[PDB]
């Protein structure tokens, strides 16, 4: 009954209680744990136990007391019907899973036994539904095929039953408890349809009944907001219908397929029309109806397509009717997020048809649709009018953005039908979009939507119109929204530009307004893709940019990208002008920093910006800049002291340093680095990050000394209290080794430096694995794994390996079964493997000695299973996954 404490804090504690559900006493304590008058909290745990045990430990069951188990479960169900809900349901499912096992009549007597009045039926239904799903996971020690086969033999009973119940209810009074039971009923069926398969030919009966059930839920509310009960029941009716057509086998039943689809259509049309009304009462019903149609077409592509061309009359009409519903669905009014939740449904559908026809006349037959659709999209591509002034919540706005993404993708797709034709329609809608603002200048929605539609196709005369239109549009007159789109749509057309002069005009202009970031992105795109072309305007932009930065109005965050465009523009500058521009554009950044160098949390920010700005400008300017860095190297030392205690600023400065250092390889920089790093070291994670980066580009003295200092300093930090600090040291432990690992593969002759103290390295490396960080353990491991690799090639290093030989594999086996979390076990099979390829013989012995000849690789694991795992581990040197399997099994058997 200790589980109670856990219910107030389930998450941070489980493990105990769970394994207790595994022990055979679980059977004895469950029924006692869920007695009368006891807390529902533990009673649910009493129920989950019996359940898990019935599916997981049927192996620990006495065939002699089989029926007892049932009678046992039947009594509880009786006690809990009316008591706690969650429990009853759990008991019901327990009764079901029980039955699953008896399959190899049971399903027929279960039904008979149950065919309070109301409750009784709930029990039965819940019981029968839980059956096909348990059989899906329940371990019956029986081949799956026969467990499926047995159940598939009683489907008709299930449905025919439900189908019988429903109709029976179609004549009586629909009690609240009646809807609910009818829900279970309809859901029961559905579950059996997706889990077990039945011929569509026998689903026509129920299909029709459910249909009328739906109707009986929708039409009384029309005169259309229905109770949740009617809605839940409706959905479930609909979902089951979906499950009915989607079946995998149905596709070959062109006959039942048409029949059912025709009845779905001719019976659901009305409801669709009524909800397409603007007085929204249920958006729920229409999504499922529209969903069902869209889906039923997916499952039967051939019927739909063949109806188009082979044109069986019955099909040409059906198909057109099915598409009209979906087309309507797509064209449905309102913004996707707020007014009509069916837009996604329709977009999903077109994708299928468009790809299905591309994978005949169907292409031409789809053109009209495709064309019409495109228009609809742009229509839905229209952002919410500020009339509603976004009375919506960002959720909706955030989701709309996602929506638009799917809507622009759909655009793309239809572009594949008409490479240029789509361009025509978009133009047409833009011309109208012209007559929209023309008559009513408040129609920016249609302007932004139209523009948006064009940008949507920017990934492939109609086009330039767009450009001109953008120039003509007086963006300062309409809502800020147009400026952001206009600019963004232009950025996407970077390629088509390679019309550039006005592009600049727009971007620079777009910077003036609220939406700077947008213009920023647009600019950066242009700079990256058509640099040569902007050379004439490089002198201009570069200077126009420096000015735009002056106002503090521009966001620093965004201002950084402008720095990117600048650096890219500078490249296209003349000899004379470059440095002066750099001076005019870089000096401020350093001096600002310098001022702060005077010597706070408010200063930390300014420090970061200036540092990143350079970092960026450098990044793009690496496409020289050496003189700039030469006279700068000293200030990074200074910034480090200010930032000695703040990694944030630290990382910021290093990045800057790194990006500029990149230019040197392609040499005076190396000197201040050892100076800048000698100040940094004087042991956060970024610090070693650069040391490695610097080192890896120098593949001799400059590098060896920095690495040697690099190792010896790390130890000092690593020298903190092993117990806590080491745990606390997770970040640096991962990093340090991650770097010493990368430095190994490249810069290999490095392992050559006899100077390096490896015994020390490994000393700590074996600890990290045994660390408390969830992932840093891979680094230590990864490191060791790559040392053993090179170690087999250098006697010098081999020594270290020989000594650390049995020690490592020991450290590995300790974590793998006693110290390393259950999940991070596989990360060790790397070192165990690296040791078999270079030292198979040695590893074969260090393994037997630590596993077969130890008192306790673990106390629980069996000497037998221990000896065999030890054998497999040493035999597999060609597979790492295998190791992970042999490793894991033992890992389990080890911890118990």
């Amino acid at each position: 009954e200790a589980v109670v404490s856990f219910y107030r804090s389930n998450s941070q504690n489980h493990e105990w209680l769970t394994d207790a559900e595994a022990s055979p006493q679980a059977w004895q304590f469950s029924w006692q744990l869920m007695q009368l008058g006891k807390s529902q909290e533990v009673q649910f745990f009493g129920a989950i136990t019996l359940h898990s045990k019935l599916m997981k430990h049927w192996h620990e069951v006495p065939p002699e007391n089989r029926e007892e188990l049932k009678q046992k479960i039947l009594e509880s169900i009786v006690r809990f019907a009316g008591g706690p809900k969650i429990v009853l349901n759990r008991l019901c499912i327990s009764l079901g899973a029980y039955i699953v096992h008896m399959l190899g009549e049971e399903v027929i007597n279960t039904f008979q036994n149950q065919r309070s009045a109301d409750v009784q039926l709930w029990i039965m239904l819940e019981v029968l539904t839980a059956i096909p799903e348990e059989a899906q996971v329940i371990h019956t020690s029986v081949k799956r095929v026969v467990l499926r086969a047995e159940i598939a033999k009683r489907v008709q009973l299930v449905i025919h039953t439900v189908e019988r119940y429903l109709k029976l209810q179609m004549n009586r009074v629909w009690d609240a408890e009646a809807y609910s039971n009818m829900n279970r009923a309809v859901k029961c069926v559905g579950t059996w349809i997706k889990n077990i398969g039945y011929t569509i030919e026998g689903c026509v009966t129920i299909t029709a009944v459910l249909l009328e059930v739906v109707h009986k839920c929708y039409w009384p509310c029309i005169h259309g907001c229905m109770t949740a009960d009617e809605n839940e029941l409706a959905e479930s009716c609909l979902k089951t219908m979906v499950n009915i057509i989607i079946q995998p086998d149905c596709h070959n039943y062109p006959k039942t397929a048409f029949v059912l689809i025709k009845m779905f259509l001719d019976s659901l049309s009305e409801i669709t029309k009524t909800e397409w009304k603007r007085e929204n009462d249920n958006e729920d019903i229409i999504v499922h109806i529209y969903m069902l149609f869209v889906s039923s077409v997916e499952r039967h592509s051939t019927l739909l397509l063949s109806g188009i061309t082979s044109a069986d009359p019955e099909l040409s009409i059906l198909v057109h009717r099915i598409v009209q519903e979906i087309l309507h669905c797509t064209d449905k009014p309102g913004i996707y997020p707020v007014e009509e939740s069916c837009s996604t449904m329709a977009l999903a559908f077109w994708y299928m048809l468009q790809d299905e026809v591309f994978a005949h006349k169907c292409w031409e037959y789809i053109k009209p649709l495709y064309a019409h659709l495109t228009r609809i999209l742009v229509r839905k591509s229209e952002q919410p009018d500020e009339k509603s002034l976004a009375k919506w919540s960002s959720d909706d706005l955030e989701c709309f953005r996602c929506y638009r993404q799917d809507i622009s993708d759909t655009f793309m797709y239809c572009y594949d039908v008409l490479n240029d034709y789509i361009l025509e329609i978009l133009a047409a809608m833009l011309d109208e979009a012209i007559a929209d603002l023309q008559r009513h200048p408040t129609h920016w929605t249609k302007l932004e939507a139209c523009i948006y539609s064009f940008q949507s196709v920017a990934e492939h005369r109609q086009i330039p119109r767009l450009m001109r239109v953008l120039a003509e549009i007086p963006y300062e007159k309409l809502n800020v929204k147009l400026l952001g789109t206009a600019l963004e749509t232009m950025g996407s057309y970077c390629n088509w530009l390679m019309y550039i002069p006005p592009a600049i005009n727009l971007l620079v202009r777009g910077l003036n307004s609220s939406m700077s970031a947008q213009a920023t992105l647009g600019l950066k795109e242009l700079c990256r893709d058509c640099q040569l072309q902007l050379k004439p305007y490089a002198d201009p932009l570069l200077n126009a940019c420096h000015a735009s930065l002056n106002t503090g109005r521009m966001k620093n965050s965004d201002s950084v990208r402008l720095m990117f465009s600048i650096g890219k523009l500078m490249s296209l500058l003349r000899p004379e002008e470059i440095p002066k521009y750099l001076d005019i554009i870089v000096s401020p950044c350093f001096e600002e920093l310098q001022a702060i160098c005077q010597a706070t949390p408010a200063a930390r920010i300014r420090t970061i910006f200036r540092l990143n700005m350079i970092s960026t400008l450098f990044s793009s300017l690496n496409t020289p800049v050496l003189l700039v860095m030469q006279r700068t190297m000293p200030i990074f030392k200074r910034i480090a002291e200010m930032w000695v205690e703040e990694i944030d600023v630290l990382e910021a400065a290093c990045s800057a340093m790194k990006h500029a250092i990149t230019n040197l390889r392609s040499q005076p920089m190396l000197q201040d680095l050892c100076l800048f790093i000698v100040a940094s070291f004087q042991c956060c994670a970024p610090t070693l990050e650069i040391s490695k980066t610097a080192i890896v580009m120098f593949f001799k003295p400059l590098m060896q000394q920095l690495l040697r200092e690099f190792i010896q300093h790390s130890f000092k930090l690593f020298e903190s209290t092993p117990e806590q600090n080491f745990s606390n040291i997770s970040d640096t432990m991962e990093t340090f080794f991650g770097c010493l690992t990368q430095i190994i593969k490249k810069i290999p002759q490095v392992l050559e430096d006899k100077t390096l103290a490896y015994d020390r390295l490994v000393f700590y490396a074996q600890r990290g694995m045994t660390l408390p960080e969830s992932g840093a353990i891979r680094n230590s491991i990864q490191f060791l794994t790559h040392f053993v690799m090179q170690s087999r090639n250098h006697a010098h290093v081999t020594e270290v390996v020989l000594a650390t030989g049995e020690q490592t594999l020991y450290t590995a086996m300790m974590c793998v079964g006693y110290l390393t979390p259950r999940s991070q076990v596989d990360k060790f099979a790397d070192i165990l493997l690296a040791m078999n390829r270079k030292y198979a013989a040695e590893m074969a012995v260090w393994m037997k000695s630590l596993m077969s000849t130890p008192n306790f690789p673990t106390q629980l694991i069996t000497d037998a299973d221990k000896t065999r795992y030890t054998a497999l581990i040493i035999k597999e040197k060609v597979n790492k996954r295998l190791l992970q399997q042999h490793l894991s099994e033992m890992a389990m058997k080890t911890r118990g």
Binding site: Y351, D355, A359, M412, Y413, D416, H460, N495, D529, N622, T623, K658, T662, R665, T693, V696, M697, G738, T741, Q742, K745, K746, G775, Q782, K880
Partner: protein, 140 residues
């Protein structure tokens, strides 16, 4: 943790057009693939099963292509531009290089490029087998 995300891109924007091969694995298991060849733009999309996401990950974790960096690497050049963006859990990466035995050696870290260009093949081969069956054809 659900942060898995993979993407790739390799194409040249010459005067003759933008040839390319760029596919992407979305978090929800959506595999969009696009490729325009000039011996035509073949769009493709599909939701790969959980397990496929797992394999993409496994291949990535064993290639240790998450440690490497394009810092010393050859940036994109007139001839080409390769992109790789992987994210697994709380670690996100994205690389930039040009398309391509000697060119890789002459690069700062040939071992860096060798791993990168080696994973790409491991991913290329997968996304191709995936598509090559769902739609009956690879790119030529």
């Amino acid at each position: 943790t659900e942060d898995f995300y993979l993407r790739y891109y390799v194409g040249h924007k010459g005067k003759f057009g933008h040839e390319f091969l760029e596919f992407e694995f979305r978090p929800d298991g959506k595999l969009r693939y696009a490729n325009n060849s000039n011996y035509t733009m073949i769009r493709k999309e599909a939701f790969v099963h959980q397990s496929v996401m797992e394999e993409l990950k496994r291949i990535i974790i064993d290639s240790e292509i998450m440690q490497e960096d394009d810092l010393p690497w050859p940036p994109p050049d007139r001839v080409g531009r390769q992109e790789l963006e992987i994210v697994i859990g709380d670690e996100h990466i994205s690389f930039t290089t040009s398309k391509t035995l000697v060119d890789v050696n002459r690069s700062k870290d040939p071992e860096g490029l060798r791993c990168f260009y080696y994973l790409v093949q491991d991913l290329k081969c997968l996304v191709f087998s995936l598509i090559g069956l769902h739609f009956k054809i690879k790119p030529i």
